[PDB]
Amino acid sequence: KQSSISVAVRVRPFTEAESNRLVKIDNGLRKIINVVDDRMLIFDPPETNPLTKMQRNAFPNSFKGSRIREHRFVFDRLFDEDCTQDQVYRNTTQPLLDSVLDGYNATVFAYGATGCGKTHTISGTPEDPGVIFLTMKELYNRIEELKDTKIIDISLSYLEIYNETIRDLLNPMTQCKNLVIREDANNKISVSNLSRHRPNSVEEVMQLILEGNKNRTCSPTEANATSSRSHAVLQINVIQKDRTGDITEEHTFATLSIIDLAGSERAAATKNRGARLNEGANINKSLLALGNCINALCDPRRRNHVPYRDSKLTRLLKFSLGGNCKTVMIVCVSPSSQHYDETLNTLKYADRAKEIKTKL
Amino acid sequence: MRECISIHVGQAGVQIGNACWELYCLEHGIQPDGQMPSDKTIGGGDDSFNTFFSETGAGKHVPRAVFVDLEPTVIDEVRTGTYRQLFHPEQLITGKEDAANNYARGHYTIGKEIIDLVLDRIRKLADQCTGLQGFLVFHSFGGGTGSGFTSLLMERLSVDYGKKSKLEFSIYPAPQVSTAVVEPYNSILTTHTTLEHSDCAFMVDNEAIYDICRRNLDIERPTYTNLNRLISQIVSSITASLRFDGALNVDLTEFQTNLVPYPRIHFPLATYAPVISAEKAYHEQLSVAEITNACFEPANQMVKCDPRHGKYMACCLLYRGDVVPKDVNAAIATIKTKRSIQFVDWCPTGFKVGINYQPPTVVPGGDLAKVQRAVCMLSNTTAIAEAWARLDHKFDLMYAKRAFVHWYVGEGMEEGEFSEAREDMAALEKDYEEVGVDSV
Amino acid sequence: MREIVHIQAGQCGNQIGAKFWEVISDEHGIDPTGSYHGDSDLQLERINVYYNEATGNKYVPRAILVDLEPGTMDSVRSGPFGQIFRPDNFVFGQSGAGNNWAKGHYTEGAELVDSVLDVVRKESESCDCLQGFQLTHSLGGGTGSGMGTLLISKIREEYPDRIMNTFSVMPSPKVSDTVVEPYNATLSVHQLVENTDETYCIDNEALYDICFRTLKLTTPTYGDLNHLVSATMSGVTTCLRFPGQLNADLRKLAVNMVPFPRLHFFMPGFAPLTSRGSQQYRALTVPELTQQMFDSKNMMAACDPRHGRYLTVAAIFRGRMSMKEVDEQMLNVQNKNSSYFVEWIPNNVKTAVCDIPPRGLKMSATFIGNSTAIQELFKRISEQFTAMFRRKAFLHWYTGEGMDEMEFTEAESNMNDLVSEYQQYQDAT
Ligand SMILES: CC(=O)O[C@H]1C(=O)[C@@]2(C)[C@H]([C@H](OC(=O)c3ccccc3)[C@]3(O)C[C@H](OC(=O)[C@H](O)[C@@H](NC(=O)c4ccccc4)c4ccccc4)C(C)=C1C3(C)C)[C@]1(OC(C)=O)CO[C@@H]1C[C@@H]2O
Ligand SMILES: Nc1nc2c(ncn2[C@@H]2O[C@H](COP(=O)(O)OP(=O)(O)OP(=O)(O)O)[C@@H](O)[C@H]2O)c(=O)[nH]1
Ligand SMILES: Nc1ncnc2c1ncn2[C@@H]1O[C@H](COP(=O)(O)OP(=O)(O)NP(=O)(O)O)[C@@H](O)[C@H]1O
Ligand SMILES: Nc1nc2c(ncn2[C@@H]2O[C@H](COP(=O)(O)OP(=O)(O)O)[C@@H](O)[C@H]2O)c(=O)[nH]1
Ligand SMILES: [Mg+2]
């Protein structure tokens, strides 16, 4: 009935370095991102001061720059530069903690290109913890609050999808052929030979996260020296049952999935090439499959069949994107022109979830 | 001097080039082995062939051409055929498979493994040119090679040359006829290269030439050879002023100056009027007025578009043979009296005219008849936008479901490009609608 | 330059491959001893696609013959073209699969897969540029389905960016020579949907119908069915070996015909099929070929295209013909039969033309269709599979070799998902 999938876009603030590197022309860099409202975004606005001389030509007198590069994107949730991590945590992932504590599944996606600020958001600094830390902290506080009349159990897994193959991050020894997706008759999906862990507090959860991230399949010489070539899926299974209630053979189950997505890549950036072309191709295909799945799920018509089997990532989250499960998507974008083209692609990827035509 | 460098990319480009170089060799007396008998017979030293050939000391005339394809088949046909001894052995081939009809392979993955060699050979050719006029690029919009690799090559050439002219002679998809399912994608993705890196792009449709062959030449079963020969005649008409004498000579710069009003409106329509079989060569006068009238007939256009649904922005009439200027003036006055041929209010002059004394040469085994007169008309008009709009509709049918997109994104192409190109095309259409509007 | 590695697995695959190599050798002028005695220079121009040159001006096919019993190897060796193959490429065991998918995939094929892959690796690095692979087998059996799927998986792991074709013989509802065909077919389609770029589905029922009606044969044998399949196989690869006006390699057909990654199960067909004593009564021209390709009776997959819509078609012509005629004939087929073509693809027909027809014909054409009617085949298998799996009829023979019921459930679910995906693009929308 309602839109279970919600898209959140966050605009980062210029770094002092970038803020003084080429913005001096304003007194070359310019803020291609403009924010008007909690659901409104303008890409490449015509806000430059010496600009009348250009539309003196764009209008029908000299057809050299008649192209209009201003785009108008609408999203469910928008965060400006001034908003801090508390507002993002409250407005994107905090409600999901209810559903997982209620019994339903929940999903969080993190997407962006290099320099977009995704790391600061999901991970953050020790002084300014990210979204994951706040979610797990409130989850454990809720568990302690509900320690009476109910018992909760937390299981943690952390896998990665690389070249359409699953690879345990917490137990790197396991071979891929062993890691296989299995669909039970309970409409639950389990990956074989997963190294499940029982952390006791958010400190242990973060320690497991860094231990896994130490193993992630990265490669150097890309715009970032530690770019990710895989989709990292962290799964927190909450299994709970009444403590002093009916002692029956029934305990309720839920999962919180947190997926850090690899950024799309244009080989044109790559020159030497090799197996990295295969990595890029797999990443782009997986992102396309995920976009198709999300667009079909949002669309009331095409969802008679949703292409879950086009990629391992969508197959794993078959029962974590539909109507019952609540999905949120944090898409971190930069306002600097240095990342112009990439940002547009990011803004085009988020928009696909719901093609809200802003011409109206 | 007046050199021109021809670049033939893909199967369509190479086959059009086969026709073109057959025609040029016949025009200048050069034999397929590259030797000119007239040099030893008459004595030589009073001929102009440098526009398309380079002479060595031994008397061999090597064409100024660069044949490129990502598969060996068509070029291998060229190196085993009659003209094996004509071209320099450096005819470029990727030692791997083709682009498989997708822009990503021709641009990003498979096309980067010969671009250095192609640019090196273009360097070696241009260094031998003292008076280089421009590049003649032949390709097809609907092909993976002829879209991706031509885009990459023209990006590189614009970076390296910039000032030199660049002329495209491209095969555009027909409205109904097609020979691949992913033609709209490749052609839309080719909008950037033909809008920002070209200087005058000529578009041709196979269906239009098929209808011309049926109606005029009386050929119910034409193959691609006839299409290529007709395109070769058009290109010969364009470059005749750089090779032969005439009353009014029109080089590339004058032609572009007279035909391109703004930097973006450089997509004219070609028309060769006296396409006539030998049987119908008799029973017809083929005067200058008749041929000039035939140029403006919608049935004779080489793109499936109706000029009556648009306003002519400029016209260039390039005549060959026995043509006097007063006959051309009378024909142009007759055309201006006609009301169905509408001109924009801001081009009162309208017509550029060139005349050349060299009549067209007939290829043995060809379909065109021997005619004392000929004309090539190059018309900048607003009707061509229709030919784009149809193609855009096809794109909008496939991209809605993201069909065939995984092939492209799995070869180093971001998804957003598919939208971006479309937007560019839409912008171009708007410009073509905003120039025909009359002044206030 | 565009080298293909051919792998034969099982009785059906080995027999089709032997007939296919006879056909290709006749096409290229290679005699049974491996010597070239052709009449034109085009045969040797692209002989490297399917053959390797041996020292005495000999040509050894780049074939790999696989089985779990030596009977079919002995049959192929003693055949007319048995002496042309490399003896080291003959890889075989001694204990057969027994019409068991588990034996040829877990127990007895797993032992031989290392040798087969060693030979595949040897035949791959000897190529200047490897276009792809070419597997011939049947899904209704043991060693065929099992070892073919295992080799598919391991080659796909080793050569992820190369084409992998598959000429797989589907089981039929009427014709049934084996009782446990549904299990094997489901377990093999579970593997083909994930690790193949082109799967050319063939049915013995459709080939027998072609023999009885089109060819008017009285006593068809497996030689004739292999003849038809080999004709199609040669037609698919024609543009990699001969020049033409429009060239189309395997990857071009895959790009044009596969709108989404999982919809790569194609129905083949061969155009000029006529009975002897009825060839003088027809004019072999492009319209006749075009009318024969799109006829329901000419398909080799035992499906009615009228029960579905064509997602895509590919027509690969051979011979001297005009491109105008082919273009109008395809446009006429699409406009006249608009109900059998999807609306959200404007042109549904990839077209390729080659300049060299087969040996005794002035022209020919190969049809490769991707339609929703193929759905029916999978549906039929399910209608058998469930009927045998609700009761666990012949299941202990599989579970005894390490398999589980989870694999059967997974394969059934994947096949039903494929059926649903094909059904999605059928109704008007
Ligand atoms: C008088 C005449 O025209 O002779 C024809 C012929 O009569 C017909 C009936 C042939 C004939 O085919 C059959 O009888 C046949 C029987 C069962 C299954 C398949 C074919 C022919 O045998 C088949 C043979 O075909 C070839 O030679 C092709 O090159 C074919 N290769 C082989 O048949 C072959 C097999 C083993 C060893 C060497 C060659 C081929 C087809 C596709 C792609 C590559 C090659 C031809 C021309 C004829 C005969 C001889 C009677 C037909 O065959 C083909 C494949 O075109 C059957 O209907 C067609 C149309 C022909 O008119
Ligand atoms: N006029 C004309 N058009 C041709 C000719 N050959 C091919 N074409 C057109 O080219 C279009 C398809 O593009 P191709 O030329 O096949 O692409 P390609 O150059 O081979 O590039 P690849 O796909 O990578 O091999 C078809 O729609 C044909 O109409 C020709 O000889 N003359
Ligand atoms: N949303 C933000 N709010 C405040 N500072 C930010 C924000 N995003 C980025 N920054 C600052 O800018 C720096 C560069 O961005 P950073 O977050 O490091 O990119 P990233 O997340 O590593 N890129 P990627 O992982 O590819 O998405 C950060 O280290 C912060 O100092
Ligand atoms: N076309 C063809 N089909 C065959 C042949 N032999 C068997 N078949 C089919 O294949 C099935 C048997 O599979 P088979 O290949 O013998 O199993 P395998 O030995 O384990 O690979 C039967 O249902 C037959 O319909 C043959 O020679 N030609
Ligand atoms: Mg080609």
Residue numbers in the entry:
A (entry chain K): 22 to 48, 101 to 433
B (entry chain A): 1 to 440
C (entry chain B): 1 to 429
Paper text:
Kinesin-8s are dual-activity motor proteins that can move processively on microtubules and depolymerize microtubule plus-ends, but their mechanism of combining these distinct activities remains unclear. The pathogenic yeast Candida albicans expresses a single kinesin-8 homolog, dubbed CaKip3, whose motor domain shares 60% sequence identity with that of S. cerevisiae Kip3. To understand the mechanistic basis for the dual-functionality of kinesin-8, we obtained seven cryo-EM structures of Candida albicans Kip3 bound to either the microtubule lattice or curved microtubule end mimics, and a microtubule-unbound CaKip3 X-ray structure. Our findings implicate loop-2 as a tubulin protofilament shape sensor that regulates conformational changes in the kinesin-8 motor domain, which can either induce curvature of protofilaments at the microtubule end, leading to microtubule depolymerization, or enable forward displacement of the neck linker for processive motility if the motor domain is bound to protofilaments in the microtubule lattice.
To investigate this hypothesis experimentally, we designed and expressed a mutant version of the CaKip3-MDN construct, whose long loop-2 was replaced with the short loop-2 sequence found in human kinesin-1, HsKIF5B (CaKip3-MDNL2-HsKHC), which does not contact α-tubulin in any of the available microtubule-bound or tubulin-bound kinesin-1 structures. In line with our hypothesis, the cryo-EM structure of this CaKip3 construct bound to microtubules has a docked neck-linker and closed nucleotide pocket in the ATP-like state (MT-CaKip3-MDNL2-HsKHC-ANP), unlike the CaKip3-MDN construct with a full loop-2 (MT-CaKip3-MDN-ANP). The gliding data shows that elimination of the CaKip3 loop-2 increased the microtubule-gliding speed of the motor by over threefold. Our microtubule-binding data showed that CaKip3-MDN has ~35-fold higher affinity for microtubules than CaKip3-MDNL2-HsKHC when AMP-PNP occupies the nucleotide-binding pocket.
